[PDB]
């Protein structure tokens, strides 16, 4: 059996080939103690990965190697994996084939470097790197799909025609679940809240994930909150103190369609779907309009699939089969893309072998 | 003095007669507000215009009024209503204005161009002029086929006796926008970000700065894949020094083999042979010898050496190939206007405010 | 005309014409242990500035101004103390300018407009945002400000004589917290400073010893290596302090609020963060012209260090310039007096008749 580790800008996702749910779902953080000690409590282990590092904000300095799918730092990424093998998945890398994810439009040098580390500091028998949305497309039951990922870091739209991604339309807004929380932290503080700590960033993250939704129309909904507390939803903080969130609740996800609310003056995910599809050829486009597949955690907000269905019905040809297929499991579909792909008896011949690596080297990827 | 304005979807350039270099230059774009949005310092403006529309895009969405050819008039009017006012600080009522059109510009839209100029503007005299004729004029040539290439436009125009043969003009829609989106595939496939419209604004520039054609396709395919020469570093306007390489040949080679996107059009060398092959036989002599190029997308280093070879391969070897490349070229249609507006014999050629009154739009 | 600069700690007043502020005093008022009514007998007004510090009440020491004026009675009281106590003039005769904090409530201005014309009977009043003025002392209409008086630091963007609210970053730090940090650290070398009289000694020490070292880490090491940063200061009574690492620990607080224990980002983080909130193109003039004002920009080194961090935070092609005047501490008044003297543009001076209406 093989291994699959989705290296997410917020949450990394490890496991084996064949399983349905990701075996090690964890924050992609490496944490290093600011002054390293002799003992327990004091800050003893040279780097901490996942939720331990995160609890231990008192002792550590927290670092995320992967920003917008682009792995920026390889010393933190590697040291994650030393822990993904020996501490998370509780395996020995040299025994199991590995599939790791990479962004839609991810660096060749970053690919070629990941290629290096895996067969080398980890000696894994076999490896393959795979483009995030294309793997969501595999978990969507397709060969053809305009797939739109929004993870914690990156938000990429891809026209998959017959398994081939068409790069000449692969689009993006650098706006995702992390930028989304920061918006809600602002607009609660502007409601009058003091939310400032990273702990209260997790408060503002939780509120985002549970109470934030995408209005079917933005302006209408605003005055709907103005006229009714319908929208207003209570929240029990770790204080026990109940707060109330109101028109914030739909303003926060609406970054994704109206990005410019953060000051991030891009076109919205609606617009970028359309603009990906036009940059394709016309028969591709037909099935892209019918095979708009959503992916990521930030694709989860209430109303988003219906809203995308609304907007793209107007933006696409009136007589077209517009069809969103929003995955229920979409915070993980990229790992479910990996695990199926690794388990594919066909795909067994598509792995990078240890042989081709030692005869040809990292440049074959 | 007269006023002269080269309207492109990329850049609109203005000024007066007599000056050698364009007085106004701006992107052709306005923004109409997705919310009521006081840019604290101005009042509630209708439209932020050009290098203003994109400055504040978060409030107000970018459109291009004229994709080489006029579509939307509410944006369009704000562009003629930028250039006089903000850009030149001049009043329309005072100044005989000349405006351009990308070659093969149609009946209906020009009628209404002429209308608006005499009504909401009141200009004392106006003249629209066919971009590629003005290029050849600015060149100092009587005759010869011309090739405009731009962000939205490309054009082959056989000029004789100061006159374009209209029927034989080819527009190529595969222009510099297509090219910048293509570069924007490829760097992104190498792994850079480059795909928001902000990063289009960057990836336009990088191309303009570093992207060349090279004389042979197969041999350059060899160098690209094998040698560390292709790479040039570049700070984009955040700070990330990237490295562009290969694409520098693998983008503008689309003007020669348009198939690179999957658009299948004949390459410029083909279109030019065939545009001259929309003209006679021995009369073709110094069309082949006075072949002038124009516009934005003619800046690419390598194209001329390439094109001469590729047009000669297509053609009966005795035709004297002489293709001219000025260094000012984004402005050649402005400098075809200003000096030709200053030229005395032209006072009679303008469309006056009076003649408009009697003739209506129908004088354009 | 007059110019009367108001804030959470210090108030500067004088005339239009003069180069240097005539009166500069603490915004402290006292309010009684509850004898009397708001309209009734007894000193509501009580004691402002030094007279209130000297004794401290009872007449409880309500500072009214947190940049934003929280309660308007105490401001009235100060403004009495200005025209009548500090200047000793006639308010009816002398048109007054007053200096407001960017992001003041518009309603807060209405009340400023009223108390002036009603209780003080001033013939005309003007009111101007402390930031643009801070630039008018440096001769500019446009630019990014880092004001850092005694109360709250201020990262204010300016286009063409106007502030842009959406970027105006506050940091709850300056001058005062800067001395009350210095008190905690002098304690480590025996000198537990405690009284207000001692806080006046300690504040002289801030000006004399405490300085924005260009870098924090190379500096720490030099302190730990060698005494050259250490410098003795004689206390007025007869004693002598010696201070080393601490000397730069005390101004570093602007760049690191974790020192005091505040959840808020250092001035380098906020300056930049305000300019990102600026218009993608106007940003260039602002970066090109950063102007920095206040008692807490008086710290030596601050301009180069700001410039170092903003260069390390802005793109490679970003033309940045920081600007601090040698008179920087007062600049809102110097900027103000120039404006208040601008006798041609005059109709800005909204009169009593332009108020009878």
mmCIF file of N, CA, C and O in Angstrom, chain A residues 296-360:
data_model
loop_
_atom_site.group_PDB
_atom_site.id
_atom_site.type_symbol
_atom_site.label_atom_id
_atom_site.label_comp_id
_atom_site.label_asym_id
_atom_site.label_seq_id
_atom_site.Cartn_x
_atom_site.Cartn_y
_atom_site.Cartn_z
ATOM 1 N N UNK A 296 -12.069 22.492 -1.883
ATOM 2 C CA UNK A 296 -11.411 23.179 -0.798
ATOM 3 C C UNK A 296 -12.377 23.404 0.346
ATOM 4 O O UNK A 296 -13.572 23.089 0.302
ATOM 5 N N UNK A 297 -11.808 23.954 1.407
ATOM 6 C CA UNK A 297 -12.540 24.221 2.631
ATOM 7 C C UNK A 297 -13.348 25.492 2.475
ATOM 8 O O UNK A 297 -14.515 25.600 2.858
ATOM 9 N N UNK A 298 -12.698 26.462 1.843
ATOM 10 C CA UNK A 298 -13.281 27.756 1.552
ATOM 11 C C UNK A 298 -14.324 27.647 0.448
ATOM 12 O O UNK A 298 -15.138 28.552 0.308
ATOM 13 N N UNK A 299 -14.417 26.555 -0.304
ATOM 14 C CA UNK A 299 -15.622 26.336 -1.084
ATOM 15 C C UNK A 299 -16.821 25.833 -0.275
ATOM 16 O O UNK A 299 -17.891 25.633 -0.855
ATOM 17 N N UNK A 300 -16.739 25.635 1.051
ATOM 18 C CA UNK A 300 -17.827 25.060 1.843
ATOM 19 C C UNK A 300 -18.975 25.951 2.313
ATOM 20 O O UNK A 300 -19.992 25.422 2.768
ATOM 21 N N UNK A 301 -18.899 27.276 2.177
ATOM 22 C CA UNK A 301 -19.847 28.172 2.836
ATOM 23 C C UNK A 301 -21.280 28.007 2.329
ATOM 24 O O UNK A 301 -21.446 27.813 1.120
ATOM 25 N N UNK A 302 -22.338 28.034 3.157
ATOM 26 C CA UNK A 302 -23.726 27.920 2.714
ATOM 27 C C UNK A 302 -24.142 28.902 1.622
ATOM 28 O O UNK A 302 -23.873 30.102 1.665
ATOM 29 N N UNK A 303 -24.802 28.354 0.609
ATOM 30 C CA UNK A 303 -25.226 29.126 -0.547
ATOM 31 C C UNK A 303 -24.213 29.177 -1.685
ATOM 32 O O UNK A 303 -24.582 29.592 -2.781
ATOM 33 N N UNK A 304 -22.956 28.740 -1.526
ATOM 34 C CA UNK A 304 -21.938 28.955 -2.553
ATOM 35 C C UNK A 304 -22.189 28.236 -3.881
ATOM 36 O O UNK A 304 -21.928 28.802 -4.945
ATOM 37 N N UNK A 305 -22.744 27.018 -3.851
ATOM 38 C CA UNK A 305 -22.955 26.221 -5.058
ATOM 39 C C UNK A 305 -24.143 26.713 -5.878
ATOM 40 O O UNK A 305 -24.131 26.732 -7.107
ATOM 41 N N UNK A 306 -25.165 27.132 -5.133
ATOM 42 C CA UNK A 306 -26.368 27.749 -5.660
ATOM 43 C C UNK A 306 -26.047 29.132 -6.203
ATOM 44 O O UNK A 306 -26.528 29.503 -7.273
ATOM 45 N N UNK A 307 -25.239 29.916 -5.480
ATOM 46 C CA UNK A 307 -24.785 31.224 -5.933
ATOM 47 C C UNK A 307 -23.967 31.105 -7.214
ATOM 48 O O UNK A 307 -24.200 31.879 -8.146
ATOM 49 N N UNK A 308 -22.996 30.183 -7.266
ATOM 50 C CA UNK A 308 -22.255 29.926 -8.493
ATOM 51 C C UNK A 308 -23.170 29.501 -9.631
ATOM 52 O O UNK A 308 -22.982 29.899 -10.782
ATOM 53 N N UNK A 309 -24.180 28.683 -9.316
ATOM 54 C CA UNK A 309 -25.198 28.327 -10.289
ATOM 55 C C UNK A 309 -25.974 29.547 -10.777
ATOM 56 O O UNK A 309 -26.209 29.638 -11.981
ATOM 57 N N UNK A 310 -26.341 30.481 -9.896
ATOM 58 C CA UNK A 310 -26.992 31.730 -10.277
ATOM 59 C C UNK A 310 -26.127 32.533 -11.245
ATOM 60 O O UNK A 310 -26.521 32.768 -12.389
ATOM 61 N N UNK A 311 -24.917 32.887 -10.801
ATOM 62 C CA UNK A 311 -24.080 33.829 -11.526
ATOM 63 C C UNK A 311 -23.694 33.261 -12.883
ATOM 64 O O UNK A 311 -23.953 33.870 -13.927
ATOM 65 N N UNK A 312 -23.185 32.023 -12.913
ATOM 66 C CA UNK A 312 -22.772 31.393 -14.168
ATOM 67 C C UNK A 312 -23.941 31.127 -15.125
ATOM 68 O O UNK A 312 -23.720 31.059 -16.328
ATOM 69 N N UNK A 313 -25.202 31.049 -14.677
ATOM 70 C CA UNK A 313 -26.352 30.960 -15.580
ATOM 71 C C UNK A 313 -26.521 32.259 -16.374
ATOM 72 O O UNK A 313 -26.953 32.261 -17.531
ATOM 73 N N UNK A 314 -26.167 33.377 -15.740
ATOM 74 C CA UNK A 314 -26.212 34.665 -16.413
ATOM 75 C C UNK A 314 -24.973 34.920 -17.265
ATOM 76 O O UNK A 314 -25.063 35.473 -18.358
ATOM 77 N N UNK A 315 -23.796 34.545 -16.751
ATOM 78 C CA UNK A 315 -22.514 34.741 -17.423
ATOM 79 C C UNK A 315 -22.245 33.797 -18.587
ATOM 80 O O UNK A 315 -21.690 34.182 -19.618
ATOM 81 N N UNK A 316 -22.650 32.532 -18.454
ATOM 82 C CA UNK A 316 -22.644 31.579 -19.550
ATOM 83 C C UNK A 316 -23.864 31.791 -20.435
ATOM 84 O O UNK A 316 -24.820 32.435 -19.993
ATOM 85 N N UNK A 317 -23.839 31.295 -21.675
ATOM 86 C CA UNK A 317 -25.002 31.151 -22.531
ATOM 87 C C UNK A 317 -26.277 30.738 -21.808
ATOM 88 O O UNK A 317 -26.324 29.717 -21.117
ATOM 89 N N UNK A 318 -27.314 31.553 -21.992
ATOM 90 C CA UNK A 318 -28.642 31.310 -21.453
ATOM 91 C C UNK A 318 -29.194 29.903 -21.672
ATOM 92 O O UNK A 318 -29.822 29.319 -20.783
ATOM 93 N N UNK A 319 -28.965 29.337 -22.869
ATOM 94 C CA UNK A 319 -29.435 27.987 -23.167
ATOM 95 C C UNK A 319 -28.440 26.893 -22.787
ATOM 96 O O UNK A 319 -28.529 25.767 -23.291
ATOM 97 N N UNK A 320 -27.464 27.177 -21.927
ATOM 98 C CA UNK A 320 -26.460 26.188 -21.594
ATOM 99 C C UNK A 320 -26.735 25.440 -20.298
ATOM 100 O O UNK A 320 -27.238 25.979 -19.297
ATOM 101 N N UNK A 321 -26.312 24.173 -20.319
ATOM 102 C CA UNK A 321 -26.290 23.412 -19.088
ATOM 103 C C UNK A 321 -25.081 23.836 -18.264
ATOM 104 O O UNK A 321 -23.949 23.360 -18.400
ATOM 105 N N UNK A 322 -25.413 24.841 -17.461
ATOM 106 C CA UNK A 322 -24.626 25.206 -16.303
ATOM 107 C C UNK A 322 -24.898 24.151 -15.239
ATOM 108 O O UNK A 322 -26.047 23.797 -14.937
ATOM 109 N N UNK A 323 -23.806 23.625 -14.693
ATOM 110 C CA UNK A 323 -23.865 22.644 -13.633
ATOM 111 C C UNK A 323 -22.594 22.719 -12.812
ATOM 112 O O UNK A 323 -21.482 22.405 -13.249
ATOM 113 N N UNK A 324 -22.842 23.202 -11.598
ATOM 114 C CA UNK A 324 -21.897 23.058 -10.500
ATOM 115 C C UNK A 324 -22.036 21.633 -9.968
ATOM 116 O O UNK A 324 -23.157 21.109 -9.907
ATOM 117 N N UNK A 325 -20.950 20.947 -9.625
ATOM 118 C CA UNK A 325 -21.012 19.733 -8.845
ATOM 119 C C UNK A 325 -20.107 20.123 -7.691
ATOM 120 O O UNK A 325 -18.889 20.183 -7.852
ATOM 121 N N UNK A 326 -20.716 20.481 -6.558
ATOM 122 C CA UNK A 326 -19.972 20.747 -5.340
ATOM 123 C C UNK A 326 -19.859 19.490 -4.485
ATOM 124 O O UNK A 326 -20.861 18.964 -3.993
ATOM 125 N N UNK A 327 -18.644 18.946 -4.347
ATOM 126 C CA UNK A 327 -18.339 17.832 -3.469
ATOM 127 C C UNK A 327 -18.716 18.126 -2.023
ATOM 128 O O UNK A 327 -18.451 19.217 -1.491
ATOM 129 N N UNK A 328 -19.431 17.200 -1.371
ATOM 130 C CA UNK A 328 -19.697 17.256 0.056
ATOM 131 C C UNK A 328 -18.397 17.142 0.838
ATOM 132 O O UNK A 328 -18.158 17.925 1.754
ATOM 133 N N UNK A 329 -17.497 16.234 0.471
ATOM 134 C CA UNK A 329 -16.231 16.099 1.171
ATOM 135 C C UNK A 329 -15.183 17.141 0.759
ATOM 136 O O UNK A 329 -13.981 16.945 0.968
ATOM 137 N N UNK A 330 -15.535 18.321 0.232
ATOM 138 C CA UNK A 330 -14.553 19.125 -0.496
ATOM 139 C C UNK A 330 -13.353 19.712 0.233
ATOM 140 O O UNK A 330 -12.380 20.097 -0.412
ATOM 141 N N UNK A 331 -13.306 19.693 1.568
ATOM 142 C CA UNK A 331 -12.111 20.086 2.322
ATOM 143 C C UNK A 331 -10.956 19.086 2.182
ATOM 144 O O UNK A 331 -9.875 19.267 2.751
ATOM 145 N N UNK A 332 -11.240 17.946 1.539
ATOM 146 C CA UNK A 332 -10.354 16.786 1.485
ATOM 147 C C UNK A 332 -10.264 16.127 0.107
ATOM 148 O O UNK A 332 -9.470 15.201 -0.092
ATOM 149 N N UNK A 333 -11.038 16.592 -0.881
ATOM 150 C CA UNK A 333 -11.163 15.924 -2.176
ATOM 151 C C UNK A 333 -9.848 15.722 -2.923
ATOM 152 O O UNK A 333 -9.669 14.789 -3.711
ATOM 153 N N UNK A 334 -8.924 16.664 -2.710
ATOM 154 C CA UNK A 334 -7.538 16.578 -3.165
ATOM 155 C C UNK A 334 -6.787 15.390 -2.548
ATOM 156 O O UNK A 334 -5.960 14.742 -3.214
ATOM 157 N N UNK A 335 -7.012 15.062 -1.266
ATOM 158 C CA UNK A 335 -6.415 13.858 -0.704
ATOM 159 C C UNK A 335 -7.153 12.673 -1.293
ATOM 160 O O UNK A 335 -6.505 11.711 -1.704
ATOM 161 N N UNK A 336 -8.486 12.711 -1.344
ATOM 162 C CA UNK A 336 -9.251 11.665 -2.016
ATOM 163 C C UNK A 336 -8.885 11.540 -3.502
ATOM 164 O O UNK A 336 -9.023 10.477 -4.097
ATOM 165 N N UNK A 337 -8.341 12.602 -4.096
ATOM 166 C CA UNK A 337 -7.761 12.528 -5.418
ATOM 167 C C UNK A 337 -6.482 11.717 -5.380
ATOM 168 O O UNK A 337 -6.296 10.825 -6.212
ATOM 169 N N UNK A 338 -5.630 11.952 -4.377
ATOM 170 C CA UNK A 338 -4.368 11.254 -4.263
ATOM 171 C C UNK A 338 -4.559 9.774 -3.983
ATOM 172 O O UNK A 338 -4.122 8.950 -4.779
ATOM 173 N N UNK A 339 -5.244 9.432 -2.887
ATOM 174 C CA UNK A 339 -5.491 8.048 -2.493
ATOM 175 C C UNK A 339 -6.080 7.148 -3.582
ATOM 176 O O UNK A 339 -5.595 6.030 -3.797
ATOM 177 N N UNK A 340 -7.093 7.593 -4.328
ATOM 178 C CA UNK A 340 -7.608 6.851 -5.474
ATOM 179 C C UNK A 340 -6.506 6.704 -6.520
ATOM 180 O O UNK A 340 -6.183 5.577 -6.913
ATOM 181 N N UNK A 341 -5.864 7.821 -6.900
ATOM 182 C CA UNK A 341 -4.818 7.808 -7.908
ATOM 183 C C UNK A 341 -3.711 6.836 -7.523
ATOM 184 O O UNK A 341 -3.375 5.967 -8.329
ATOM 185 N N UNK A 342 -3.238 6.849 -6.275
ATOM 186 C CA UNK A 342 -2.228 5.920 -5.812
ATOM 187 C C UNK A 342 -2.738 4.490 -5.904
ATOM 188 O O UNK A 342 -2.040 3.618 -6.418
ATOM 189 N N UNK A 343 -3.973 4.230 -5.465
ATOM 190 C CA UNK A 343 -4.584 2.911 -5.622
ATOM 191 C C UNK A 343 -4.928 2.458 -7.039
ATOM 192 O O UNK A 343 -5.278 1.291 -7.254
ATOM 193 N N UNK A 344 -4.856 3.322 -8.056
ATOM 194 C CA UNK A 344 -5.182 2.900 -9.413
ATOM 195 C C UNK A 344 -4.190 1.937 -10.058
ATOM 196 O O UNK A 344 -3.028 2.248 -10.337
ATOM 197 N N UNK A 345 -4.687 0.737 -10.352
ATOM 198 C CA UNK A 345 -3.931 -0.355 -10.974
ATOM 199 C C UNK A 345 -3.345 -0.056 -12.356
ATOM 200 O O UNK A 345 -2.373 -0.658 -12.819
ATOM 201 N N UNK A 346 -3.998 0.883 -13.030
ATOM 202 C CA UNK A 346 -3.492 1.544 -14.220
ATOM 203 C C UNK A 346 -2.314 2.447 -13.861
ATOM 204 O O UNK A 346 -1.182 2.237 -14.305
ATOM 205 N N UNK A 347 -2.596 3.430 -12.991
ATOM 206 C CA UNK A 347 -1.617 4.389 -12.484
ATOM 207 C C UNK A 347 -0.392 3.757 -11.830
ATOM 208 O O UNK A 347 0.623 4.440 -11.685
ATOM 209 N N UNK A 348 -0.398 2.472 -11.455
ATOM 210 C CA UNK A 348 0.820 1.800 -11.005
ATOM 211 C C UNK A 348 2.022 1.944 -11.921
ATOM 212 O O UNK A 348 3.167 2.026 -11.469
ATOM 213 N N UNK A 349 1.761 2.014 -13.225
ATOM 214 C CA UNK A 349 2.840 2.311 -14.154
ATOM 215 C C UNK A 349 3.208 3.789 -14.272
ATOM 216 O O UNK A 349 4.215 4.111 -14.897
ATOM 217 N N UNK A 350 2.454 4.728 -13.692
ATOM 218 C CA UNK A 350 2.770 6.151 -13.774
ATOM 219 C C UNK A 350 3.624 6.712 -12.637
ATOM 220 O O UNK A 350 4.090 7.853 -12.706
ATOM 221 N N UNK A 351 3.843 5.952 -11.556
ATOM 222 C CA UNK A 351 4.766 6.357 -10.493
ATOM 223 C C UNK A 351 6.183 6.622 -10.976
ATOM 224 O O UNK A 351 6.685 5.951 -11.879
ATOM 225 N N UNK A 352 6.859 7.581 -10.347
ATOM 226 C CA UNK A 352 8.295 7.720 -10.527
ATOM 227 C C UNK A 352 8.923 6.645 -9.645
ATOM 228 O O UNK A 352 8.781 6.636 -8.412
ATOM 229 N N UNK A 353 9.566 5.710 -10.343
ATOM 230 C CA UNK A 353 10.291 4.621 -9.705
ATOM 231 C C UNK A 353 11.623 5.046 -9.085
ATOM 232 O O UNK A 353 12.239 6.033 -9.508
ATOM 233 N N UNK A 354 12.119 4.323 -8.070
ATOM 234 C CA UNK A 354 13.505 4.503 -7.660
ATOM 235 C C UNK A 354 14.532 4.263 -8.771
ATOM 236 O O UNK A 354 15.585 4.902 -8.785
ATOM 237 N N UNK A 355 14.208 3.404 -9.743
ATOM 238 C CA UNK A 355 15.115 3.145 -10.845
ATOM 239 C C UNK A 355 15.318 4.406 -11.674
ATOM 240 O O UNK A 355 16.418 4.955 -11.660
ATOM 241 N N UNK A 356 14.275 4.912 -12.341
ATOM 242 C CA UNK A 356 14.331 6.114 -13.172
ATOM 243 C C UNK A 356 14.886 7.341 -12.474
ATOM 244 O O UNK A 356 15.380 8.283 -13.104
ATOM 245 N N UNK A 357 14.737 7.369 -11.152
ATOM 246 C CA UNK A 357 15.336 8.410 -10.351
ATOM 247 C C UNK A 357 16.855 8.273 -10.282
ATOM 248 O O UNK A 357 17.559 9.290 -10.300
ATOM 249 N N UNK A 358 17.389 7.056 -10.206
ATOM 250 C CA UNK A 358 18.824 6.918 -10.066
ATOM 251 C C UNK A 358 19.563 6.819 -11.387
ATOM 252 O O UNK A 358 20.756 7.118 -11.460
ATOM 253 N N UNK A 359 18.863 6.388 -12.440
ATOM 254 C CA UNK A 359 19.390 6.488 -13.789
ATOM 255 C C UNK A 359 19.179 7.873 -14.391
ATOM 256 O O UNK A 359 20.105 8.437 -14.974
ATOM 257 N N UNK A 360 17.992 8.470 -14.244
ATOM 258 C CA UNK A 360 17.718 9.773 -14.843
ATOM 259 C C UNK A 360 17.794 10.988 -13.921
ATOM 260 O O UNK A 360 18.099 12.083 -14.409
#
